[PDB]
C-alpha cells in the first residue's frame, strides 16, 4: 500500500505522483479551472479569470489605502485596482508579443492570437469584476465596515 508513485509511470521524470499532486480531487479541481477546462475559447478563460481576480483586487486597496479614512475610499480603491489591472494587461500584452510567433492556430492559450484573446478577455473581465465589487460595497453597508456594522 504505497501512496506515492512515479509521475505518469515515468520514474525518471522530475516529478512524483502524490495525493496532493495526483489525487482525483486535485485532478478534478485542476481540470475544472478555466485555465484547463475543455471546450472554452481563450476569450472566455480570460473573462472568468479576470472577473475573479479583478473582483478580489478591490478589497485591499479600499481597506488599507492612504484614503481609507476618507469618504472617497471606495472610489480611490477601485481606481487603484483599475490601474493595477491596466498594468497587468500591459504585462500580458508584452508577454504575448515576445513569447509567441504568429501562427494560424488560435484555439490554444500558448499561441499569439489565443494569448491576445486571453488578454482581451482578462481586461474586460477585470473591469467588470472590479465594477461589480465597487457596486456591492457601495450599496451594502455590511461590506463598508467589514462586519463591525453588526456590533
Amino acid at each position: 500500500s504505497q501512496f506515492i508513485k512515479p509521475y505518469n509511470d515515468d520514474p525518471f521524470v522530475g516529478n512524483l505522483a502524490t495525493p496532493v499532486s495526483t489525487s482525483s480531487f486535485t485532478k478534478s479541481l485542476l481540470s475544472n479551472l478555466p485555465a484547463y477546462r475543455a471546450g472554452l475559447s481563450p476569450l472566455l478563460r480570460g473573462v472568468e479569470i479576470g472577473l475573479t481576480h479583478g473582483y478580489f483586487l478591490v478589497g485591499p486597496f479600499y481597506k488599507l489605502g492612504p484614503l481609507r479614512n476618507s469618504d472617497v475610499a471606495l472610489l480611490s480603491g477601485f481606481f487603484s485596482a483599475l490601474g493595477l489591472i491596466i498594468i497587468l494587461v500591459a504585462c500580458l500584452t508584452i508577454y504575448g508579443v515576445v513569447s509567441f510567433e504568429e501562427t494560424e492556430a488560435k484555439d490554444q492559450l500558448q499561441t499569439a492570437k489565443g494569448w491576445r484573446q486571453f488578454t482581451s478577455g482578462w481586461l474586460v473581465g477585470s473591469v467588470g469584476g472590479a465594477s461589480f465589487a465597487y457596486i456591492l460595497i457601495s450599496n451594502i453597508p455590511f461590506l463598508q465596515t467589514a462586519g463591525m456594522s453588526m456590533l
Partner: protein
C-alpha cells in the same frame, strides 16, 4: 553474554616518539612539509579521526579518550573557578549584603596602569566584576565560607586528574573493543538511570539535606558565620526539625506512601521567593527528585543480557506507514555505525536545550539574588543563546558530514532518508518560498514603518496607536498560564513565572520579575525571529540534502564534504560544498542570535528591569521606549544602539575601560575578517610571489615554501574573525551597559 566487556590490553605503547613527528596520524602529512599549506592541514584535520583510518574501533577509542580529555579540561576549569572564588573574591561580603555588593572574582596585577580595572565593587574589595553567576550558585548550594570553596577546588583538581588518568588508561592501556561501543541499549539504560537518574537523586538529597536549611537560615536574616555546618544538619535531626518538622517523622512516611507529611520541604509553590527573588528551593528539590524517579524508570526500557526490555531496531522497523515506504528501517545501523550521525543529533539537541535553558532561566530565576543581578542574567542568556546556536549549526554540519561520508544508498533503499533525498527539491522550494514570504511580510513592515514615520504619516504605521498587529495567540496563552493556578493546576500556590502575568516581585527596590506584555513590536520581532530561523534552516538543510549530488554537480560526493569548488565551469560552481553552506549558515546564525539578544536586552531594559520607588510605580531603565521605538529600524538604531552605547564609549578612565578597548578591538578584528572574506587566493599568491622575490634577493627564502591560505581556509579564517569580532562587540557593549546602569 550479548552485552559484555571486551578490551584490548596495551594496544598503543606510551611513547614520546610520535610527539616529535607532526603529522604522524596522516599518511599524506607524515612525509613532512614542503609548503606552508602543510602546517594548516596538520592543524585542521588532526581530530578528524575517520579520515586517517578505516577501522571503526580505533576511531571510537580515540573519541572516548578525547571525551575524557575534554572532561578533564572542564573539571580543571571548574576547579579554577572554585579556587579563584575562594582566594580572589569578595564572596563573604556578598553573602552578608547581596543587594549592594557587586560580585567580583578576578583581580589584576598592577603593571601598566591596568590596576584601574580593579573597580570598587563594594564590601571593601577591588577587582574585576564577574557575571558568570557563580556566587548565586554557591549561595544556592549552601556554601557559606571560602574554605568550602577551597575544598571544592581541590575536588575539581582531583577529578581533572582522575579524568586525564582515565583517558590515558582507556586509550593507551585498556582500550575497549568495537562491540563494547556498539551497545546503544545498555548505554541509554546506564546513562538514563545512573547518570541522569542517580545524579538527580543525589542532588535532590543535597538540596533537601544541605541547601534547604542553610538557605532557610540565610533568608531569615542569620549571618553566615553563625549558621551550622552541613554535617551538623545531617546528624542533628532536632536541628533540622526546628526548621522542617516532618524530619521528626523520619523515613517512615516515604516507605508507607504517606508523602504529604513531607509537604513542608517538598513543595509545589511556584512563583518566586520574595526575600531573594529566586525559585523556592523546596520546589526544586521535588523537581529534581521527580526527575530522578522519571529518569530511573526510563532507564529500564531497553533490552539487555536479561530478556526484559525494548529493542530499538524492532521499535524503529515497526513504525512504518503507507506514506513513508519502509519507514524508520535502517536508522539503527546508521546510528550504531556512523559517529557523525550521533554527533549531529546530539549537537542539535544540546543546542536546542541550551536555548531552552536561556529562555527558562531568564523568565524563572532559579538562584537566590540572581534576578536583581541584571548583568548575570543578560550574560547567561546571551552566552547560552550563542552556545545553542553554534551547537545547532554544528549538528547540521556533522549531519552533512555523515551524508557525504558514511551514507550508503544500498543500505538505505526506500527508507525515510531516501524519500527525503527524493523530494529535496520540493522541500527546498517550499522552504525558500516561505522564507521569502517571511522576509517580505516581516522586514517590509519595519521598512514601511520607517517610511511612514519619515513621511510624517504616524496613522499609517504598524503600531499600537495606529493599524495594529495584535499578538492575540501569545496573549491568550499568557492569560491561560496566569489563570492556571487553581483552575488547571489546583495544587500550585503561584504561577510558574510572573512573566505571563501577576504581581511585581521586587527585591531590594529592584524588579526581580514583572509581567512582560506583548504588543505590535513583539509581534514583528517574533516573526523576524521565525524568519531568520527558517532561513538558517533553509541554508543548512539545502547544504545537507545537496551534499552528495545536484543538477549542477552529479558527482559531488566524490569531491568530499569540504572542497572549494568544481572550477569556473557550468557558469561557476563556487561554494558548492556542504561546508560552504555551513559557512553561510554560521553568518545567519550570528544574525539570528544577534537579533534575539538585542530584542532580549531592549525588552528587559524597557519593560521589566528597573527600580521600584514609593507608591509602587516602577521606573524602568529606558523608560518604556520599546513600544514606540522597536517598530522601526531608526528606533533600533537610535534608542537601542546609539543610546545604550554611551556607557562603553565613555568608559575610558574608569574600571569598565577594558570593555571599551575590547569594543574597539572587536571592531578592528571583524573588519580585518572582511579582508579574508571579500578577497581571493590568486592575488595573495602573486603578492607572496613578490615577497618571495624580495626574500630571494637577500638569500633569506625559507625552505618551506610560503603559500597563500586555501580558499576554504580563507573562508574559514574570515568567518572565525568575523564571528569573534561581532560576538566581542556585542559582548563589550552588553556588559559595559548592563554593569553601568544595572
Amino acid at each position: 553474554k550479548k552485552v559484555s566487556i571486551t578490551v584490548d590490553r596495551d594496544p598503543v605503547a606510551t611513547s614520546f616518539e610520535k610527539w616529535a613527528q607532526p603529522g604522524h596520524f596522516s599518511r599524506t602529512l607524515a612525509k613532512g612539509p614542503k609548503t606552508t599549506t602543510w602546517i594548516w592541514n596538520l592543524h585542521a584535520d588532526v581530530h578528524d579521526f575517520d579520515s586517517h583510518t578505516n577501522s571503526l574501533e580505533d576511531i571510537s577509542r580515540k573519541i572516548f579518550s578525547a571525551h575524557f580529555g575534554q572532561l578533564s579540561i572542564i573539571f580543571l576549569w571548574l576547579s579554577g573557578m572554585y579556587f579563584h572564588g575562594a582566594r580572589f573574591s569578595n564572596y563573604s561580603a556578598w553573602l552578608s549584603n547581596p543587594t549592594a555588593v557587586k560580585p567580583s572574582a578576578q583581580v589584576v596585577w598592577p603593571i601598566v596602569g591596568q590596576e584601574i580595572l580593579n573597580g570598587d565593587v563594594g564590601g571593601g574589595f577591588q577587582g574585576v566584576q564577574v557575571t558568570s553567576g557563580f556566587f548565586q550558585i554557591w549561595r544556592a548550594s549552601g556554601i557559606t565560607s571560602e574554605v568550602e570553596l577551597y575544598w571544592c577546588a581541590l575536588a575539581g583538581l582531583l577529578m581533572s586528574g582522575l579524568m586525564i588518568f582515565a583517558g590515558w588508561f582507556h586509550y593507551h592501556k585498556a582500550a575497549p573493543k568495537l562491540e563494547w561501543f556498539q551497545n546503544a541499549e545498555s548505554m541509554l539504560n546506564h546513562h538514563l538511570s545512573g547518570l541522569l537518574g542517580l545524579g538527580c537523586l543525589s542532588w535532590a538529597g543535597h538540596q533537601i539535606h544541605i541547601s534547604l536549611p542553610v538557605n532557610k537560615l540565610l533568608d531569615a536574616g542569620v549571618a553566615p558565620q553563625e549558621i551550622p555546618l552541613p554535617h551538623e544538619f545531617l546528624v542533628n535531626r532536632d536541628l533540622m526539625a526546628q526548621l522542617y518538622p516532618s524530619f521528626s517523622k523520619g523515613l517512615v512516611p516515604f516507605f508507607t506512601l504517606n508523602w504529604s507529611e513531607y509537604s513542608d520541604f517538598l513543595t509545589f509553590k511556584g512563583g518566586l521567593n520574595p526575600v531573594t527573588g529566586g525559585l523556592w528551593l523546596s520546589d526544586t528539590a521535588h523537581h529534581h527528585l521527580a526527575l530522578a524517579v522519571l529518569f530511573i524508570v526510563a532507564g529500564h526500557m531497553y533490552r539487555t543480557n536479561w530478556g526484559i526490555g525494548h529493542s530499538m531496531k524492532e521499535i524503529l522497523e515497526a513504525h512504518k506507514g503507507p506514506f513513508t515506504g519502509e519507514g524508520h528501517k535502517g536508522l539503527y545501523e546508521i546510528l550504531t555505525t556512523s559517529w557523525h550521525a550521533q554527533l549531529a543529533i546530539n549537537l542539535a539537541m544540546m543546542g536546542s536545550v541550551s536555548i531552552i535553558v536561556a529562555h527558562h532561566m531568564y523568565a524563572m530565576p532559579p538562584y537566590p539574588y540572581i534576578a536583581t543581578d541584571y548583568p548575570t542574567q543578560l550574560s547567561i542568556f546571551t552566552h547560552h543563546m550563542w552556545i545553542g546556536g553554534f551547537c545547532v549549526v554544528g549538528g547540521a554540519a556533522h549531519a552533512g558530514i555523515f551524508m557525504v561520508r558514511d551514507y550508503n544508498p544500498a543500505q538505505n533503499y526506500n527508507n525515510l532518508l531516501d524519500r527525503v533525498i527524493r523530494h529535496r527539491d520540493a522541500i527546498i522550494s517550499h522552504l525558500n518560498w516561505i522564507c521569502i514570504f517571511l522576509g517580505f511580510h516581516s522586514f517590509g513592515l519595519y521598512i514601511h514603518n520607517d517610511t511612514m514615520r519619515a513621511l510624517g504619516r504616524t496613522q499609517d504605521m504598524f503600531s499600537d496607536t495606529a493599524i495594529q498587529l495584535k499578538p492575540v495567540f501569545a496573549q491568550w496563552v499568557q492569560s491561560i498560564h496566569t489563570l492556571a493556578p487553581g483552575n488547571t493546576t489546583p495544587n500550585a500556590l503561584a504561577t510558574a513565572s510572573y512573566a505571563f502575568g501577576g504581581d511585581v516581585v521586587a527585591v531590594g527596590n529592584k524588579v526581580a520579575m514583572m509581567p512582560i506584555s506583548l504588543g505590535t513590536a513583539d509581534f514583528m520581532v517574533h516573526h523576524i525571529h521565525a524568519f531568520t530561523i527558517h532561513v538558517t534552516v533553509l541554508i543548512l538543510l539545502k547544504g545537507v540534502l545537496f551534499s552528495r549530488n545536484s543538477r549542477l554537480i552529479p558527482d559531488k560526493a566524490n569531491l568530499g564534504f569540504r572542497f572549494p569548488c568544481d572550477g569556473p565551469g557550468r557558469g561557476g560552481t563556487c561554494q558548492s560544498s556542504a561546508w560552504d553552506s555551513v559557512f553561510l549558515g554560521l553568518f545567519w546564525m550570528y544574525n539570528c542570535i544577534s537579533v534575539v539578544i538585542f530584542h532580549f536586552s531592549w525588552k528587559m531594559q524597557s519593560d521589566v528591569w528597573g527600580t521600584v520607588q514609593a507608591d509602587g510605580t516602577v521606573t524602568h531603565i529606558t523608560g518604556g521606549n520599546f513600544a514606540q521605538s522597536a517598530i522601526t529600524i531608526n528606533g533600533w538604531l537610535r534608542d537601542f544602539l546609539w543610546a545604550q552605547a554611551s556607557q562603553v564609549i565613555q568608559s575610558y578612565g574608569s574600571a569598565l575601560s577594558a570593555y571599551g578597548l575590547i569594543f574597539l578591538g572587536a571592531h578592528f578584528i571583524w573588519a580585518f575578517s572582511l579582508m579574508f572574506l571579500f578577497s581571493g587566493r590568486g592575488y595573495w599568491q602573486e603578492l607572496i610571489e613578490s615577497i618571495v622575490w624580495a626574500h630571494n634577493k637577500l638569500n633569506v627564502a625559507p625552505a618551506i615554501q610560503p603559500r597563500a591560505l586555501s580558499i576554504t581556509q580563507g573562508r574559514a579564517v574570515g568567518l572565525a574573525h568575523y564571528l569573534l569580532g561581532g560576538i566581542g562587540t556585542t559582548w563589550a557593549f552588553f556588559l559595559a551597559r548592563i554593569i553601568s546602569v544595572g
